[PDB]
């Protein structure tokens, strides 16, 4: 009776930054994947560990819809085994990831004439993120021998940095909105099923 809330995940009025990527938990609903099928507006769309065609007829225990915003050059980092600022310090996928990744150009939405600086990433971190880790700590990154007593300055840098999203940026630096649909099947009842009941 109840469809899975895939609309409020994509057609949401506004997404979050990459370091605070926002997670929606999908359980107890019939999964209508056709919103992926008909919508050809998708620039990037790749599924790992599972086929998209053989998906609408397979029951899973839980689905996890992560959503955030990055730039074009960084989109290829949203995948297992990848490295980079986004993959290492913002959003890391496990090597045995089984799901799909979707991304589309949102330059019309997430760009202001003066540069929309609301979206952020983490530029520094003492170690790489574990898979599906969401670090949002604003601890001053220590870069030098002198310890940082919560103060900025010489080798004391603020860990977060802002994107410079302008309408006139090249397609490489334009804002893309990204959604990662991860899937989990455990020794437990499958609450999410395609139309094949």
């Amino acid at each position: 009776t109840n469809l899975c809330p895939f609309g409020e995940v994509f057609n949401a009025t506004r997404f979050a930054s990459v370091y605070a990527w926002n997670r929606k938990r999908i359980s107890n609903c019939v999964a209508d994947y056709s919103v992926l099928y008909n919508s050809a507006s998708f620039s990037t769309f790749k599924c790992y560990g599972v086929s998209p065609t053989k998906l609408n007829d397979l029951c899973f225990t839980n689905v996890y819809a992560d959503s955030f915003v990055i730039r074009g050059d960084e989109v290829r980092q949203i995948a297992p085994g990848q490295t980079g600022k986004i993959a290492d310090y913002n959003y890391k996928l496990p090597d045995d990831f089984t799901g799909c990744v979707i991304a589309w150009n949102s330059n019309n939405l997430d760009s202001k004439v003066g540069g929309n600086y609301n979206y952020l990433y983490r530029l520094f971190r003492k170690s790489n993120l574990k898979p599906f880790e969401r670090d949002i700590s604003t601890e001053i990154y220590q870069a030098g021998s002198t310890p940082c007593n919560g103060v900025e300055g010489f080798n004391c840098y603020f860990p977060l940095q802002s994107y410079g999203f302008q309408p006139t940026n090249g397609v490489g630096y334009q804002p893309y909105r990204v959604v990662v649909l991860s899937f989990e099947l455990l020794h437990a009842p499958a609450t999410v099923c395609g139309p094949k009941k």
Partner: antibody
Amino acid sequence: EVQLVESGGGVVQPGRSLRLSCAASAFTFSSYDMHWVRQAPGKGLEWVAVISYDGSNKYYADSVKGRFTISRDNSKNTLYLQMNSLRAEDTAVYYCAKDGGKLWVYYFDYWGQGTLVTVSS
Amino acid sequence: DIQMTQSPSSLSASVGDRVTITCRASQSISSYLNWYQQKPGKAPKLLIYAASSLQSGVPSRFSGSGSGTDFTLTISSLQPEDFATYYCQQSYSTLALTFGGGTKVEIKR
């Protein structure tokens, strides 16, 4: 006993269009995902595109996305591959292939003998 | 993207020898690797799918193995109708299927 018959290959100039067709036989065609896979002369094999068993889903490689178009007619048991704006990189023998579906992921169960498509001006 | 390094690039082996071919992945694939045969000119043909599952109608002498990145195809006793170029093919990246370079098996002499 499974057969696939490609046809429609031939010489073609750059930027033109060409229609390929695979005729399936001896299995339930309308219930298997279908594949196109190409192989340049002397080079290795290259996955091209996928269409679902119902024809609702259409997926392409990054080298041909927005430039080829896969389709299928289940009543005629045929698999179509429209090739618009052919470049020199497309010069290859193209194969149609049945998925098999025994996995959550795509594999190639049976191969057609293929048809030659040469792009040259 | 995922690349597949298949080694050796070309080998020489006579009939009856225990032939082994290695296929290595740029990153982890659970077990979604596939081994294909291709005679010169003829179309390819499925031998092994999903690491080590023998396709129906393929001789029992063929056998796959391996998990993670370093996979292996093995012919226990080579036969004359087996001299052909063997490809390996990953599937984990479903919407970006990539194959290996291949390993032609030439008749040793």
